Amino acid sequence: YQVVASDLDGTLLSPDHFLTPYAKETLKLLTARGINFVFATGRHYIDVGQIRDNLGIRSYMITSNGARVHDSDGQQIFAHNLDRDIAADLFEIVRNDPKIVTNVYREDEWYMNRHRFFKEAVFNYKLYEPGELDPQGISKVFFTCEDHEHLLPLEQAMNARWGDRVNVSFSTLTCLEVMAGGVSKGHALEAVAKMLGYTLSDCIAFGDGMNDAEMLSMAGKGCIMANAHQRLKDLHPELEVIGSNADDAVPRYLRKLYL
Ligand SMILES: [Ca+2]
To answer: Does residue 54 sit in the same domain as residue 88?
Structure first.
């Protein structure tokens, strides 16, 4: 596989959200052998600044679950946003639910409907009142709620409401995310593979969340983390389940496969 695609949190990153020296060295060893790396996250691009400064290699960066792609120079290749009418509705769909907080990534800004490491980028929220947020430039809307079971009926209602026009995915149990239809880490990986002169068949992917499901099944080879959500394991039982990110399972798997 000429292209290695990996999710960050819960996948390549340690349980303490760090890139280990072992993992950094693995990226260098495979880069020296002509292997390409693509990192895919639900995070905003500003929120992966410290990670990209510590990778040690030049790589394509998929952020906001495939709504954005940047090259190694920080140049935004594409921005695939939510349709204006859908973004406008998502801003207010659960305004009056005290259990849910509505979050929005609009371009380089983070908005929140109401109030819910030292070398990390400054990335804060602004508050928005009904109607005071522009529904253009929306990479994603995400609903945060401590009660996972309370988010499940909201996932169903939005899928039934918009169908193909949205991609609804959980990241954590407490974060239900909405991107434009046709936008996912998998669809962005396919686009990036083509930029590199390859196809999905040339890709091996690693992930642990529902926002990795398309990426793991579309890639030539998909690996599910041992620490992954059970719903991901249940949806794709045909995929290999590897070790935990606590063991640095991804770089160890790569060294065993390539070196
Ligand atoms: Ca993850």
So the answer is: no
Phi, psi at 243, each rounded to 5°:
-65, -175
108 is catalytic: no
Task: Write out the residues surrounding ion ligand 1, Cβ under 5 A.
Answer: 7, 9-10, 208-209
Residues 119 and 168 in one domain: yes
DSSP code at position 81: P
Q: By C-alpha distance, which of 27, 108, 125 is closest to 64?
A: 108
Which of 7, 97, 108, 234 does the annotation list as catalytic?
7
- Residue 208 marked as a ligand binder: yes
Location of structure tokens 């005290």: 98
* 75 and 12 fall within a common domain: yes
Extended strands (E) in 43-194 = 60-63, 68-70, 76-79, 101-106, 109-112, 125-127, 138-144, 166-170, 175-180
Residue 169 CB: number of other CB atoms within 10 A?
23
SS3 99: coil
DSSP 200: G
- Per 3-state DSSP, the chain is made up of helix, strand and coil in percentages (nearest 5) of 35, 25, 40
Q: Which of 141, 152, 147 is nearest to 93 (CA)?
A: 141
- The answer on whether 47 is annotated among ligand-binding residues is no
Which method was it determined by?
X-ray
